[PDB]
Amino acid sequence: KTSRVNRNRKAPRLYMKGTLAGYTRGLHGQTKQTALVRVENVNTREDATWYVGKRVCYVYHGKKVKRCVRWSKAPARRSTTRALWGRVTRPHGNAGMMRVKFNGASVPASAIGRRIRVYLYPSQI
Amino acid sequence: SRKSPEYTTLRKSCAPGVIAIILAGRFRGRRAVILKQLPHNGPLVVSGPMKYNGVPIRRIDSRYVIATSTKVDISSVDTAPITPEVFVSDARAQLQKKIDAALIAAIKKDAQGKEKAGYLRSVFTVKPGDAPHRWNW
Amino acid sequence: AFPSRKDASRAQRKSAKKHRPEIIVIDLKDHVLGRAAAVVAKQLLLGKKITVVRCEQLNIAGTEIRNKIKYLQYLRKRKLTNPTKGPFHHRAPSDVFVRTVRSMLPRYTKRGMKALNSLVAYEGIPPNVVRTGGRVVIPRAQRHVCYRSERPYTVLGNMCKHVGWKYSDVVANLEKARVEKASRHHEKQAKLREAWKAARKEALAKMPKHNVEVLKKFGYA
Amino acid sequence: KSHYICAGRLVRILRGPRQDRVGVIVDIVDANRVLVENPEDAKMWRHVQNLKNVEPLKYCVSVSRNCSAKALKDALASSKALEKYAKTRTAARVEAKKACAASTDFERYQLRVARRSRAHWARKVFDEKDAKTPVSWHKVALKKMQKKA
RNA sequence: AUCGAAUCGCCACCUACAAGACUGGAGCUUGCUCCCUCGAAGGCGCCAAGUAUAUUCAUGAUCACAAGACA
RNA sequence: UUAGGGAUAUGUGGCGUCAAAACUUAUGGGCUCAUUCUCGAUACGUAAAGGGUGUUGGUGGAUAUCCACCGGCCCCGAAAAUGGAUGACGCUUAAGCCCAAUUAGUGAUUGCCCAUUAUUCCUUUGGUAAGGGCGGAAACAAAGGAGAAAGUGUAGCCCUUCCGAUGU
RNA sequence: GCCAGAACCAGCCCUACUGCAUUAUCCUGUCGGGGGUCAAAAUCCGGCGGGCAAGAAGUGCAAGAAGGGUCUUGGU
Ligand SMILES: NC[C@@H]1O[C@H](O[C@H]2[C@@H](O)[C@H](O[C@@H]3[C@@H](O)[C@H](N)C[C@H](N)[C@H]3O[C@H]3O[C@H](CO)[C@@H](O)[C@H](O)[C@H]3N)O[C@@H]2CO)[C@H](N)[C@@H](O)[C@@H]1O
Numbered sequence: 001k002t003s004r005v006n007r008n009r010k011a012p013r014l015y016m017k018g019t020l021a022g023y024t025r026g027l028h029g030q031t032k033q034t035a036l037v038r039v040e041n042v043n044t045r046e047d048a049t050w051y052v053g054k055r056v057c058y059v060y061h062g063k064k065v066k067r068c069v070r071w072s073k074a075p076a077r078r079s080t081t082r083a084l085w086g087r088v089t090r091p092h093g094n095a096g097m098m099r100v101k102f103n104g105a106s107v108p109a110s111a112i113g114r115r116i117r118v119y120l121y122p123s124q125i
Numbered sequence: 126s127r128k129s130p131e132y133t134t135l136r137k138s139c140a141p142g143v144i145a146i147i148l149a150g151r152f153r154g155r156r157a158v159i160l161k162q163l164p165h166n167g168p169l170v171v172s173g174p175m176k177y178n179g180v181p182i183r184r185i186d187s188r189y190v191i192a193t194s195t196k197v198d199i200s201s202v203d204t205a206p207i208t209p210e211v212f213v214s215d216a217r218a219q220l221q222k223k224i225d226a227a228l229i230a231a232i233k234k235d236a237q238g239k240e241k242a243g244y245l246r247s248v249f250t251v252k253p254g255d256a257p258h259r260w261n262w
Numbered sequence: 263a264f265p266s267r268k269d270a271s272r273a274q275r276k277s278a279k280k281h282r283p284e285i286i287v288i289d290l291k292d293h294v295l296g297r298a299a300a301v302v303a304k305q306l307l308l309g310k311k312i313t314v315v316r317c318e319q320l321n322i323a324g325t326e327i328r329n330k331i332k333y334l335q336y337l338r339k340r341k342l343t344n345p346t347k348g349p350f351h352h353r354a355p356s357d358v359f360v361r362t363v364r365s366m367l368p369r370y371t372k373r374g375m376k377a378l379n380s381l382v383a384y385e386g387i388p389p390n391v392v393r394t395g396g397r398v399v400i401p402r403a404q405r406h407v408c409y410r411s412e413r414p415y416t417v418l419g420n421m422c423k424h425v426g427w428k429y430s431d432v433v434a435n436l437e438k439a440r441v442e443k444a445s446r447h448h449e450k451q452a453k454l455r456e457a458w459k460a461a462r463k464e465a466l467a468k469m470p471k472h473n474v475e476v477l478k479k480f481g482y483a
Numbered sequence: 484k485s486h487y488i489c490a491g492r493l494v495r496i497l498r499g500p501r502q503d504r505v506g507v508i509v510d511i512v513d514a515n516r517v518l519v520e521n522p523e524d525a526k527m528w529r530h531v532q533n534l535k536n537v538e539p540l541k542y543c544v545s546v547s548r549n550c551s552a553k554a555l556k557d558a559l560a561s562s563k564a565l566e567k568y569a570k571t572r573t574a575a576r577v578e579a580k581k582a583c584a585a586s587t588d589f590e591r592y593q594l595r596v597a598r599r600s601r602a603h604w605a606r607k608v609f610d611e612k613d614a615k616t617p618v619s620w621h622k623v624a625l626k627k628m629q630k631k632a
Numbered sequence: 633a634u635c636g637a638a639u640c641g642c643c644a645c646c647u648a649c650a651a652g653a654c655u656g657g658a659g660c661u662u663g664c665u666c667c668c669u670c671g672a673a674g675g676c677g678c679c680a681a682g683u684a685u686a687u688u689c690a691u692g693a694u695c696a697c698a699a700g701a702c703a
Numbered sequence: 704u705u706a707g708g709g710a711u712a713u714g715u716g717g718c719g720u721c722a723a724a725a726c727u728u729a730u731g732g733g734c735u736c737a738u739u740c741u742c743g744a745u746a747c748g749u750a751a752a753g754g755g756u757g758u759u760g761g762u763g764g765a766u767a768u769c770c771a772c773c774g775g776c777c778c779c780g781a782a783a784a785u786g787g788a789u790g791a792c793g794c795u796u797a798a799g800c801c802c803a804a805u806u807a808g809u810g811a812u813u814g815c816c817c818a819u820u821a822u823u824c825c826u827u828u829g830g831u832a833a834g835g836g837c838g839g840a841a842a843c844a845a846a847g848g849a850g851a852a853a854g855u856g857u858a859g860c861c862c863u864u865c866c867g868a869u870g871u
Numbered sequence: 872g873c874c875a876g877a878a879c880c881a882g883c884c885c886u887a888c889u890g891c892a893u894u895a896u897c898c899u900g901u902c903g904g905g906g907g908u909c910a911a912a913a914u915c916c917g918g919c920g921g922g923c924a925a926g927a928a929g930u931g932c933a934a935g936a937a938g939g940g941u942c943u944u945g946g947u
């Protein structure tokens with residue numbers, strides 16, 4: 001009957017929300033070797049140098065439940081959810097975009113415009 | 126000197142007593158106190174204490190920890206070698222509480238020490254409009 | 263598009279909470295037509311869901327006679343062989359803006375069609391958009407910072423009513439009826455807006471004083 | 484009402500390498516530049532500011548054009564213009580960001596427990612005044628219910 | 633009922649409205665002086681329903697989609 | 704100016720969207736308004752004589768006002784046969800034109816975006832290629848290992864080094 | 872002989888930390904002659920008296936033996 005607010009005592013997020021903008025490209029076409037991630041509230045080139053070296057994830061799902069990590073140790077995280085991982089390598093332009101490279105492959109082109117999470121580890125401070 | 130177990134290369138911010146942020150693992154976003162560093166440039170060992178935030182004595186490394194400016198100045202017992210953490214046992218359940226109660230003993234005799242005990246119970250999360258790249262810690 | 267019975271039974275088998283996606287609603291009163299369209303064309307293509315509102319209030323620089331002729335030079339274009347296959351000339355301000363956004367998108371791929379169907383672009387503020395959160399604005403495109411105030415400008419609802427667009431007066435009576443309704447709602451709760459701020463000044467000195475000179479260091483008193 | 488660029492008009496710098504610092508206009512060059520000096524501040528020596536970077540305040544010392552750099556320190560001392568500025572609310576917002584841009588994580592926690600205190604008190608004061616007058620939505624609907632149910 | 637999924641900010645305080653050659657209120661010397669609401673914050677939310685010696689948390693073992701998800 | 708690939712840095716050209724980069728940069732200066740092929744705008748590259756009391760600077764004369772000249776942008780001059788093109792949208796506190804900067808009278812360097820170029824790191828292949836080793840040093844069972852050819856060309860005798868590489 | 876994480880070597884690629892010279896058409900001091908103003912400070916010109924405008928200058932050269940990269944090389 002009283003004024004009781006909502007409080008957001010969920011599990012925390014320790015990542016920064018970013019967007020796969022696209023790839024490095026010129027007029028002549030793409031270089032899919034390295035990708036471009038626009039992270040929210042990062043808007044100066046000095047603000048992207050803080051994030052250089054952090055780990056980066058693109059979370060998606062498949063169709064079947066293929067095998068994840070801790071498949072035997074933790075069968076509750078068995079999911080259709082997959083993930084591709086990367087590192088921020090360098091800033092890209094004055095406007096605070098990052099130039100990331102994923103591990104051993106490239107990010108799928110389906111991910112362009114979709115949510116990429118960038119993390120706070122590996123830590124420097 | 127590099128083969129000596131006292132050889133560290135760890136950051137000057139991750140000192141014993143420095144209140145940390147866990148950033149990863151099970152207890153992410155919690156605030157745990159850094160107890161010491163294991164030998165042969167080993168990982169950090171953090172207790173919460175479990176009385177406050179639920180973080181036991183556990184190994185974590187430096188790159189998965191934001192070390193802040195806030196210290197509590199522990200001078201507590203260090204009988205946690207590189208082998209209670211090997212393949213809850215009543216030894217680790219006793220080693221917990223003997224270091225657990227030594228933390229709260231050192232939390233409360235700190236000036237502004239009740240403000241820091243509440244600081245260890247809060248949870249760090251990234252809000253939808255805040256910039257961790259422009260913050261002092 | 264109403265949801266089908268396959269899309270309705272699954273919201274009953276699974277007990278689906280009423281869901282709203284993260285939609286940014288821009289109030290385009292007094293915006294530059296192509297500066298707002300380019301900010302929107304980049305955000306839609308970065309995966310933002312954008313509802314655009316009040317498109318009859320967009321501004322184009324120049325005399326109204328000038329911008330009306332440029333639409334009539336555009337209406338001069340049609341496929342002479344078969345004009346049913348021709349350029350289709352949309353007269354609504356809400357449809358002039360969808361075109362101007364679309365001509366800044368990669369329109370002939372699927373990534374640029376997934377971004378043009380993320381834009382909605384109403385005109386006036388419809389009843390489903392009113393109470394869904396505060397409208398936002400594009401402060402780098404707002405005509406009081408982008409047009410020199412001595413130069414003439416052109417309201418898009420007035421350019422478009424003289425080239426077609428037979429619903430100018432309908433929009434003008436749906437927005438006269440809204441601002442009358444939304445100002446009756448705002449004289450209400452003025453003893454609720456003043457109730458909280460006379461309780462947030464009263465919460466001081468009822469709260470401990472060691473949390474007030476930390477609330478006055480950061481200027482939140 | 485807007486405040487004119489004149490000799491003596493205190494301006495605050497908008498976004499230079501200064502961003503928050505106040506200074507006194509001691510000469511007007513032309514339609515877009517002035518000379519700005521505040522003897523009280525270290526970084527505010529007599530330099531040239533573009534008028535797109537200034538913000539004129541309501542305060543204006545009675546000093547002449549191209550002052551002598553020692554009668555300027557006399558002019559803002561007798562006027563007390565720096566202290567009248569130092570108690571305005573907009574100046575408090577300047578010194579408040581300087582705490583937020585220098586806050587540690589512990590004094591960001593202190594701001595969160597201060598705001599959750601004041602918020603908890605303002606919603607229980609709002610509770611124990613909405614029982615007396617039926618203002619809120621819980622209390623309008625129950626007042627128009629118990630009168631006929 | 634297949635269905636495991638990608639998404640991660642809530643509000644019956646924002647969710648009314650104009651204006652920028654002005655938009656707190658007045659004075660008259662019309663660019664200065666004077667008044668308090670001081671003119672540069674929509675509120676909340678971020679782990680005791682609230683700043684106070686209160687009581688669970690491990691063994692999920694050192695990162696992995698957050699193994700949670702009705703705020 | 705071109706072997707098969709990476710990293711960094713450039714060049715020509717760019718930085719409002721398409722489209723990578725000024726999330727439409729400056730805490731730079733001026734100039735410009737154009738009403739039915741619709742001002743203008745990336746060289747090569749495909750409208751003139753003449754006119755204007757449009758605006759903005761100059762020069763020389765004269766008594767705050769006139770007079771003769773010269774320049775910048777803008778307008779007029781300027782009329783064709785499918786609907787049509789600064790590449791498109793658009794832009795007018797430019798996203799136009801001429802100058803100029805590089806985070807701005809703060810304290811000295813290089814704003815950043817793109818190559819089959821440059822530097823450097825690997826791998827290949829060929830040299831007017833250049834050097835080294837090739838008398839098995841000793842020793843060693845099962846229940847530290849194998850190779851070692853005096854060689855144009857091989858699954859190249861084995862290593863080290865250097866330069867070149869596209870083509871009808 | 873699979874996938875990740877950190878650590879530490881070496882190499883190489885980044886960026887922090889700066890000295891030597893130079894000021895003068897300049898700095899400062901007062902008496903003029905000039906200005907404008909309600910009166911006068913300034914802009915401006917000139918005498919001879921002193922000078923260091925001192926993270927002082929965006930002027931010449933810079934040699935200052937690291938914190939970050941290396942799914943930008945090899946190793947344990
Ligand atoms: N295009 C045909 C398809 O290629 C697939 O493979 C494709 C990718 O999945 C695959 O990428 C793999 C990736 O699976 C895995 N996560 C890591 C692996 N390193 C990647 O492979 C990549 O890296 C290495 C570099 O030498 C190469 O072996 C490979 O050619 C290269 N594509 O390389 C191919 C990209 O063109 C599958 N073989 C199969 O779906 C199908 O044959």
Ligand SMILES: [Mg+2]
């Ligand atoms: Mg050629």
Ligand SMILES: [Mg+2]
């Ligand atoms: Mg041949």
